[PDB]
Amino acid sequence: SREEVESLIQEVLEVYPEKARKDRNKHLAVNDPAVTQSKKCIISNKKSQPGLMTIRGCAYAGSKGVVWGPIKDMIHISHGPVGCGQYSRAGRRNYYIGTTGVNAFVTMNFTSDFQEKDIVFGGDKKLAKLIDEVETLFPLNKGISVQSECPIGLIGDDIESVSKVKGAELSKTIVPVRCEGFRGVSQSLGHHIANDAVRDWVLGKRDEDTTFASTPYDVAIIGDYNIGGDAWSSRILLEEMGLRCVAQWSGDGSISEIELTPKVKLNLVHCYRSMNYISRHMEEKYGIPWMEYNFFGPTKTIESLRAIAAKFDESIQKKCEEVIAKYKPEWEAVVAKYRPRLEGKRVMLYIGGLRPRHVIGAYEDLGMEVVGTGYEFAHNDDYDRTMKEMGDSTLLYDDVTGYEFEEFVKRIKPDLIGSGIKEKFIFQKMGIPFREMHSWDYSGPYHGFDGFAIFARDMDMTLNNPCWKKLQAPWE
Amino acid sequence: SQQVDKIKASYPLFLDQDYKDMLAKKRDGFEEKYPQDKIDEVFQWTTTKEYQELNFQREALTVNPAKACQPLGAVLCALGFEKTMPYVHGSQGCVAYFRSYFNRHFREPVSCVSDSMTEDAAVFGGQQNMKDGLQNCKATYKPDMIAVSTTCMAEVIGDDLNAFINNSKKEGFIPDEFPVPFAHTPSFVGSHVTGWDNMFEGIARYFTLKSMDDKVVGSNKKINIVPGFETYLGNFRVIKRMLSEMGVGYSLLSDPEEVLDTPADGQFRMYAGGTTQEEMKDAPNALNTVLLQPWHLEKTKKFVEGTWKHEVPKLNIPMGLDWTDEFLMKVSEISGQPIPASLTKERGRLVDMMTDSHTWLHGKRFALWGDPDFVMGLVKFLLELGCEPVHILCHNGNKRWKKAVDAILAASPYGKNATVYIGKDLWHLRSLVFTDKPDFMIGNSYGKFIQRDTLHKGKEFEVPLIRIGFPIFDRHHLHRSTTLGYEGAMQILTTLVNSILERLDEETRGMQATDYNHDLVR
Amino acid sequence: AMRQCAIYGKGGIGKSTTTQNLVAALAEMGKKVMIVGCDPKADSTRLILHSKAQNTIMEMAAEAGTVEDLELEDVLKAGYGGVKCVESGGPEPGVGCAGRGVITAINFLEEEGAYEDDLDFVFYDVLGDVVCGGFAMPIRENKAQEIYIVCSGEMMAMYAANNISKGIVKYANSGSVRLGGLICNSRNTDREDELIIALANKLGTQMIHFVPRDNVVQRAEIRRMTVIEYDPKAKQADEYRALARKVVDNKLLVIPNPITMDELEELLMEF
Amino acid sequence: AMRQCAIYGKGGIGKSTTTQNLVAALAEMGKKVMIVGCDPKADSTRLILHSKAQNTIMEMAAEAGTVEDLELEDVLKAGYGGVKCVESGGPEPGVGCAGRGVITAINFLEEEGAYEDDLDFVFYDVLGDVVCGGFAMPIRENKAQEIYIVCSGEMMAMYAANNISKGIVKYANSGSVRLGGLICNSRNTDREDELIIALANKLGTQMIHFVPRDNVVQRAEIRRMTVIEYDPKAKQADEYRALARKVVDNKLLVIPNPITMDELEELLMEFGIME
Ligand SMILES: Nc1ncnc2c1ncn2[C@@H]1O[C@H](COP(=O)(O)OP(=O)(O)O)[C@@H](O)[C@H]1O
Ligand SMILES: Nc1ncnc2c1ncn2[C@@H]1O[C@H](COP(=O)(O)OP(=O)(O)O)[C@@H](O)[C@H]1O
Ligand code: CLF
Ligand code: SF4
Ligand SMILES: [Ca+2]
Ligand SMILES: [Mg+2]
Ligand SMILES: [Mg+2]
């Protein structure tokens, strides 16, 4: 109930000191589907209170980790000490096709590897030396990007000049990116720093080039990172509908695809938080319109295929119907097999920016009810989009602390919890089935119709796995 | 498309013809990919000697490092203590990364907190974050002790940890009495091992420095054991079991084994076990302090020898038959307790396994990498097994250590083709396996990729990866293994001989081709 | 529509003093102005404000501990004649970059909405001695379109003038940055004026106004007020109105031709 | 033991002229001395050198395009009294960090072997207007053990001196860097000596010397030579000998207790600078 959820929030906040307690209450809300504006309900995207175990990453993670790292052809240098590149290497599954270390470098870790001589003297000379070295060793790379770690902003290193001078010397595009960890308050400013970096150094190169032949059906998937091959499964559906996909941002992406993007007629934006900055820019500079779409679950996909097709002519609309007709028996078969298995099960989700709101349709397609949801680093426009999707009196949390999350889960008692790696081991211990939402628990793809079968099957094996019955010892 | 009866995951889903056609179209249509012949030409080039030279000529670019930063080392060590919460002063993205890197290797929850310093915190300093952070963390997680380490942003701006912590207590944010040991842990300097060493000397120093007069050496008749940075549970377990078996009293400082291994019984335990504060306080009263991994325990050796006046024995990490004999004999001399019949039986069994598996093991060539103590230990054991370690790489190693290992290699006729490389990454190693080919690679999960590259050149050129080391993320529960002692040696011996036998079977499995040698009894 | 100009010069030569006076003449004129000081000294906003010290964004934000946390009203306070005054502030000596403090302070104001407040003019009191990315930040992002450098008869003021002009030259293609004029502060030099204009001509910009040394200026400063404000009837007070009248009137922005050290040697030697 | 000294101050106050002249005197005495100017002007090595300009490590490193590729004999050239004169120089304005060029230069000088050359003294000319890490690097590394601040009767110099002392205090736990004294240059103010010593007392360090404003430095300077070298007999030549004598003789290095702007403001009026 609303009074009960409200009490639960108040009850939990009692443990915190006052500055932290006062600030946190602003981030916890009981959802009202009716409210138009998020700010009345919840406040978001504010610096985290120290010592509370927030799940948020840094700006480097948002820029190097999510937007930039997935491009296959380019080489990304983690500039600074050795750790950031190391923890983040091959951590995220933005799937790509290439010969690694030769023409594609995603899983590879490239670093300046700062030592104290570099921190005292500075790293510009080294970055230039590294750029030259990178060039002799890996001759087929199509670009270079420098992702700034925290010490770069602090020691006064100018990477723009080195990037500008070397780029000129190598007739190669080098993108300096200032995603220092201290900048921003979450993985979020990183996306913006990364988006802006893409726009200043890589978007306008084929500004005057008219050689590429373009059909009116050309479209670019924006903000789909191909985790587990999500983009590929999403891409095949658009192609079958008759649209041509010129570019993917940035999963399994290439710099050539990105430079050719402005040539496209429409931009489909899957992840609003990460790449909406680029989308708006493209609409202002090139006039290309952008529409947010959802491919999780058969209902969102059908609704999404339909909307995208309307923006196009009747042949496309007709083709859209054939495709929905084609995959309809496949998805319903999955529903028939797995809905009886997952029906009425309550779900709690914590993830960073796009997914808490987005996977709701898919869970509901399986008869599961999402009792509560939250975001690691989502803005309020993200929250505006969230409440319509969330049911009434459901719990909403922004930048939930670890302690808040455990207490909420103990009270609410959800059947299954979708969240990241740090949160997962605590919950299994508690005996609650956990599915990792970020990595799709090394499974996927969860996007599209093909993705949905994997998703229903995954929720079912974990939720109904025999191991949950076994936790209390028989001898009391 | 998906048959509901047998659903396909990414693999082999993308292997389907519609998807294959789609990817090709995407590759041909928008990727502007270099021709396959060119890609092939370039790939064969990296496998060559000429490329190794240019690759080994690098002075500024590091590709695929074998080392991680200091705070990782500091958080792991802080985890060793009872009801202790690791606390890292600096930016938060670092904490998320440490918890995830640890979570994946241990498949266990890792508790860590940050004071969350921002851009604004960069100009003013870390003082507010530290007071609020210390106050918020204590109220929220109820840790008995909070151990502070710092992120590079904090190290570069220069926040004073001692001043900050004292002012927090002085201003009243946290009690005066609440323990708050702190260690500066610059990521640019060293590695996670050094990070571990710093945190420990700091914790040891905070508890024992003010009171030394009351302490008298050998008064408590226990031997302090300092593990160092360790990611195998069996190691903590084995050291304790043998001392226990021998009857020797002991204190293991920084024991993270209960917490990293808590049971799923329906209740989540943030803190489990750990070294007690009293154990830390009463430590100088030990007869002696033994350091398990001496190469990264140098700062701690200085504090323990100088402040506690313990004469730390020079002993190598207890790996292999000789080193473990040396550690036991030494414990026997310090304890005054004899090595029991039970332990001598275990050594006998190790030798019996060595005599039993020697023909397959002999002459095998290995390329291996890791932290310096572990690599050093492994090198010593392989030579004891008569195997030939061709390429030895320690990224975070040094000149003295290299000198130490070369001496070890010189002592054995087996260490003839062996070469030690320090400051060289996995990219360098890739080149080494391609130019001079080892039978096997012993290392962490990062080597999965080197193996993939060798198989690409050819079946015959592939070097299978054998995983011993940290981090291991593609296999499950290996962190439950033991590398120390006779038990560790036995585990290591079984994995190497079986890795070798598993490979021979694969090579001889072809029907009417190579199956003549695909023997039932080996 | 809105022009933002930044005052640059060597320390101790009168930029805080010169800027405040020119702005009060402008305010007396009814023009709405905001003065943001990028100088670590933070005495930039002292005369209009009539306050001993103006708390910097950095001093206010440090106690609060976070930047968006801090209030605009507490940070930005209104001076005499309705002028807006704020101190960018900066870092502790030897920590981070002094110049970065200018940047967070300027972005906080943009986000907080100080600009697009229909402000007629914006002036940045800036430290002109060392050209650094952090110090030359207002030059890099187009924080300020027209830059006016305070210079005098000695070797240091002319050299710093040349250096700042060197800076405007490097960032010309990316920005709209131009050198607005050269304001000469009297060092009571024998041929100070001909020298600044001569140094100015070679440079490519006309010296906008010559400012004499007056004790009225010294006296107004002790009372913590501007000359225009303390004595409206004064010659020095009327002088400032000339520079302010000239600044509104001047329409010449030029990309500088930095001069060589030697020409500076021949030139100092010429007058 | 070879010695390292730094002159830090507000620009245009005579840091270079005073530093060069003191070293000429020590060169007169016979101590082997080396001067490195970390100020971007590089007119710092001009009086000793007898060169209109001195090509820097920064200028020399470029064109050459590699720092270690650059030769020492070309980079360091010996002056009057046999004192080595070298220039750190720096980047074209607005690009990178200026103090940074100072660091690469000392590193270059240390790596190429200038020190442990049994030079009795080493003098660093540094821009004292702003303190940030590139500038504060000599303070950060223990580049200069003893620091001397040139300052005058004007309020800007005292802000500069006060500002630099705050620098030393921050790097005090890490380093062996300590402020030596406050050198004083006369601008012909009413009570320059009394005012500087009061501030020195407030700062916690002694004002080392009072250097009179004289037209003789100018005559020697235009000739592009030092005062001690030009008129050994001159009165200004004896004063510079005294500073040289005072610096070698001085044994008081202290970590400064910085005064507030109010204390600085209050102390200027105490002598009547401001009513
Ligand atoms: N035109 C002037 N007439 C008289 N005194 C002046 C004049 N300009 C500046 N001053 C005095 O000289 C000093 C230096 O100028 P100031 O603006 O404070 O330095 P900065 O250029 O570093 O901001 C002040 O103490 C001020 O009273
Ligand atoms: N004692 C002195 N008496 C008179 N003039 C001096 C004296 N010391 C220096 N000067 C003059 O004053 C100026 C400042 O000295 P300089 O080293 O060039 O400045 P900075 O090192 O501050 O850039 C020079 O033009 C110099 O000739
Ligand atoms: S916020 Fe990297 S792990 Fe950290 S202490 Fe630095 S070296 Fe080590 Fe963000 S940019 Fe990166 S991820 Fe952190 S580290 Fe800073
Ligand atoms: S950029 Fe300039 S102000 Fe900043 S640290 Fe470097 S030299 Fe100092
Ligand atoms: Ca587990
Ligand atoms: Mg000022
Ligand atoms: Mg000088």
Coordinates of N, CA, C and O in Angstrom, one line a residue, chain A residues 8-79:
Chain A
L8 N 7.9 2.5 5.0 CA 9.1 1.7 4.8 C 10.2 2.6 4.5 O 11.4 2.4 5.0
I9 N 10.0 3.6 3.7 CA 11.1 4.6 3.3 C 11.5 5.4 4.5 O 12.7 5.5 4.7
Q10 N 10.6 5.8 5.3 CA 10.9 6.6 6.5 C 11.6 5.7 7.5 O 12.6 6.2 8.2
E11 N 11.2 4.5 7.7 CA 11.8 3.5 8.6 C 13.2 3.3 8.3 O 14.0 3.3 9.1
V12 N 13.5 3.1 7.0 CA 14.9 2.8 6.6 C 15.8 4.0 6.8 O 17.0 3.8 7.3
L13 N 15.4 5.2 6.4 CA 16.2 6.4 6.6 C 16.6 6.8 8.0 O 17.4 7.6 8.2
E14 N 16.0 6.1 9.0 CA 16.4 6.4 10.4 C 17.8 6.1 10.8 O 18.3 6.8 11.7
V15 N 18.5 5.2 10.2 CA 19.9 4.8 10.5 C 20.9 5.9 10.1 O 21.8 6.1 10.8
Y16 N 20.6 6.6 9.0 CA 21.5 7.7 8.5 C 21.6 9.0 9.3 O 20.7 9.4 10.0
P17 N 22.8 9.6 9.3 CA 23.1 10.8 10.0 C 22.2 11.8 9.3 O 21.7 11.5 8.1
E18 N 21.9 13.0 9.8 CA 21.1 14.0 9.2 C 21.3 14.6 7.8 O 20.4 14.6 7.0
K19 N 22.6 15.0 7.5 CA 22.8 15.6 6.2 C 22.5 14.5 5.1 O 21.9 14.7 4.1
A20 N 23.0 13.3 5.4 CA 22.8 12.1 4.5 C 21.3 11.7 4.5 O 20.7 11.5 3.4
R21 N 20.7 11.7 5.6 CA 19.2 11.3 5.7 C 18.4 12.3 5.0 O 17.4 12.0 4.3
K22 N 18.7 13.6 5.2 CA 17.9 14.6 4.6 C 18.0 14.5 3.1 O 17.0 14.6 2.4
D23 N 19.2 14.3 2.6 CA 19.4 14.2 1.1 C 18.8 13.0 0.5 O 18.2 13.0 -0.5
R24 N 19.0 11.8 1.2 CA 18.4 10.6 0.7 C 16.9 10.5 0.5 O 16.4 10.1 -0.5
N25 N 16.2 11.1 1.5 CA 14.7 11.0 1.3 C 14.3 11.6 0.0 O 13.2 11.3 -0.5
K26 N 15.0 12.5 -0.6 CA 14.7 13.2 -1.8 C 14.8 12.2 -3.0 O 14.3 12.4 -4.1
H27 N 15.6 11.2 -2.8 CA 15.8 10.1 -3.8 C 15.0 8.9 -3.7 O 15.2 7.9 -4.5
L28 N 14.1 8.8 -2.7 CA 13.2 7.6 -2.6 C 11.8 8.0 -2.7 O 11.3 8.9 -2.0
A29 N 11.0 7.4 -3.6 CA 9.6 7.8 -3.8 C 8.7 6.6 -4.0 O 9.1 5.6 -4.5
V30 N 7.4 6.8 -3.6 CA 6.4 5.8 -3.8 C 5.8 6.3 -5.1 O 5.3 7.4 -5.2
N31 N 5.7 5.4 -6.1 CA 5.2 5.9 -7.4 C 3.8 6.1 -7.7 O 2.9 5.3 -7.3
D32 N 3.5 7.3 -8.3 CA 2.2 7.7 -8.7 C 2.3 7.7 -10.2 O 3.0 8.6 -10.7
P33 N 1.5 6.9 -10.9 CA 1.5 6.8 -12.3 C 0.9 8.0 -13.0 O 1.3 8.4 -14.1
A34 N 0.1 8.7 -12.2 CA -0.6 9.9 -12.6 C 0.3 11.1 -12.8 O 0.1 11.8 -13.7
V35 N 1.3 11.3 -11.9 CA 2.2 12.4 -12.0 C 3.0 12.5 -13.3 O 3.8 11.7 -13.7
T36 N 2.8 13.7 -13.9 CA 3.4 14.2 -15.2 C 4.9 14.5 -15.0 O 5.7 14.1 -15.9
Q37 N 5.2 15.2 -13.9 CA 6.6 15.6 -13.6 C 7.2 14.9 -12.5 O 6.7 14.7 -11.4
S38 N 8.4 14.4 -12.8 CA 9.2 13.6 -11.9 C 9.7 14.5 -10.7 O 9.6 14.0 -9.5
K39 N 10.1 15.7 -10.9 CA 10.6 16.5 -9.8 C 9.6 16.6 -8.7 O 10.0 16.8 -7.5
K40 N 8.3 16.4 -8.9 CA 7.5 16.5 -7.7 C 7.8 15.3 -6.9 O 8.0 15.3 -5.7
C41 N 7.8 14.1 -7.5 CA 8.0 12.9 -6.9 C 9.4 12.5 -6.4 O 9.5 12.1 -5.3
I42 N 10.4 12.7 -7.2 CA 11.8 12.4 -6.9 C 12.8 13.3 -7.4 O 12.6 14.0 -8.4
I43 N 14.0 13.4 -6.8 CA 15.1 14.3 -7.2 C 16.2 13.3 -7.7 O 16.3 12.2 -7.1
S44 N 17.0 13.7 -8.7 CA 18.0 12.8 -9.2 C 19.2 13.4 -9.8 O 19.3 14.6 -10.0
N45 N 20.3 12.6 -10.0 CA 21.5 13.0 -10.6 C 22.2 14.1 -9.8 O 22.6 15.1 -10.4
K46 N 22.4 13.8 -8.6 CA 23.1 14.7 -7.6 C 24.3 13.9 -7.0 O 24.3 12.7 -7.0
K47 N 25.3 14.6 -6.5 CA 26.5 14.0 -6.0 C 26.0 13.1 -4.8 O 25.1 13.4 -4.1
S48 N 26.6 11.9 -4.8 CA 26.3 10.8 -3.9 C 26.9 11.2 -2.5 O 27.9 11.9 -2.4
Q49 N 26.2 10.7 -1.4 CA 26.7 11.0 -0.1 C 27.8 10.0 0.2 O 27.7 8.8 -0.1
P50 N 28.9 10.4 0.8 CA 30.1 9.6 1.1 C 29.9 8.5 2.1 O 29.2 8.7 3.2
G51 N 30.5 7.3 1.9 CA 30.4 6.2 2.9 C 29.2 5.4 2.9 O 29.0 4.6 3.7
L52 N 28.3 5.6 1.9 CA 27.0 4.9 1.8 C 26.9 3.7 0.9 O 25.9 3.1 0.7
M53 N 28.0 3.4 0.2 CA 28.1 2.3 -0.8 C 27.3 2.4 -2.0 O 26.6 1.5 -2.4
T54 N 27.3 3.5 -2.7 CA 26.6 3.8 -3.9 C 27.2 2.9 -5.0 O 28.4 2.5 -4.9
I55 N 26.4 2.4 -5.9 CA 26.8 1.5 -7.0 C 27.3 2.3 -8.2 O 27.8 1.7 -9.2
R56 N 27.3 3.6 -8.2 CA 27.8 4.4 -9.3 C 29.3 4.3 -9.7 O 30.2 4.2 -8.9
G57 N 29.5 4.3 -11.0 CA 30.9 4.3 -11.5 C 31.3 5.7 -11.8 O 30.6 6.7 -11.3
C58 N 32.4 5.9 -12.5 CA 32.9 7.3 -12.8 C 32.6 7.7 -14.2 O 32.1 7.0 -15.0
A59 N 33.1 8.9 -14.6 CA 32.9 9.5 -15.9 C 33.7 8.8 -16.9 O 33.3 8.7 -18.1
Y60 N 34.8 8.2 -16.5 CA 35.7 7.4 -17.3 C 34.9 6.2 -17.8 O 35.0 5.7 -18.9
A61 N 34.2 5.6 -16.8 CA 33.4 4.4 -17.1 C 32.4 4.8 -18.1 O 32.1 4.0 -19.1
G62 N 31.7 5.9 -17.9 CA 30.7 6.2 -18.9 C 31.3 6.5 -20.3 O 30.7 6.1 -21.3
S63 N 32.4 7.3 -20.3 CA 32.9 7.6 -21.7 C 33.7 6.4 -22.3 O 33.5 6.1 -23.4
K64 N 34.7 5.9 -21.6 CA 35.6 4.8 -22.2 C 34.9 3.5 -22.2 O 34.9 2.7 -23.2
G65 N 34.2 3.2 -21.1 CA 33.5 2.0 -20.9 C 32.3 1.7 -21.8 O 32.1 0.6 -22.2
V66 N 31.4 2.7 -21.9 CA 30.2 2.6 -22.7 C 30.2 3.2 -24.0 O 29.8 2.5 -25.0
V67 N 30.3 4.5 -24.2 CA 30.3 5.0 -25.6 C 31.4 4.7 -26.6 O 31.2 4.2 -27.7
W68 N 32.7 4.9 -26.2 CA 33.9 4.7 -27.0 C 34.5 3.3 -27.2 O 34.8 2.9 -28.3
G69 N 34.5 2.5 -26.1 CA 35.1 1.2 -26.1 C 34.5 0.3 -27.2 O 35.3 -0.3 -27.9
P70 N 33.2 0.3 -27.3 CA 32.7 -0.6 -28.4 C 33.1 -0.3 -29.8 O 33.0 -1.3 -30.6
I71 N 33.6 0.8 -30.1 CA 34.0 0.9 -31.6 C 35.1 0.0 -31.9 O 36.2 0.1 -31.4
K72 N 34.9 -0.9 -32.9 CA 35.9 -1.9 -33.2 C 37.2 -1.5 -33.9 O 38.3 -1.9 -33.5
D73 N 37.1 -0.6 -34.9 CA 38.3 -0.2 -35.6 C 39.2 0.7 -34.9 O 40.4 0.6 -35.1
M74 N 38.7 1.7 -34.1 CA 39.6 2.5 -33.3 C 40.2 1.9 -32.1 O 39.8 0.9 -31.6
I75 N 41.4 2.5 -31.7 CA 42.1 2.1 -30.5 C 41.9 3.1 -29.4 O 42.1 4.3 -29.6
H76 N 41.5 2.7 -28.2 CA 41.3 3.6 -27.1 C 42.3 3.5 -26.0 O 42.4 2.4 -25.4
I77 N 43.0 4.6 -25.8 CA 44.0 4.6 -24.8 C 43.5 5.1 -23.5 O 42.9 6.2 -23.4
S78 N 43.7 4.3 -22.4 CA 43.2 4.8 -21.1 C 44.5 5.5 -20.7 O 45.6 4.9 -20.5
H79 N 44.3 6.8 -20.6 CA 45.4 7.7 -20.2 C 45.4 7.9 -18.7 O 44.4 8.5 -18.1

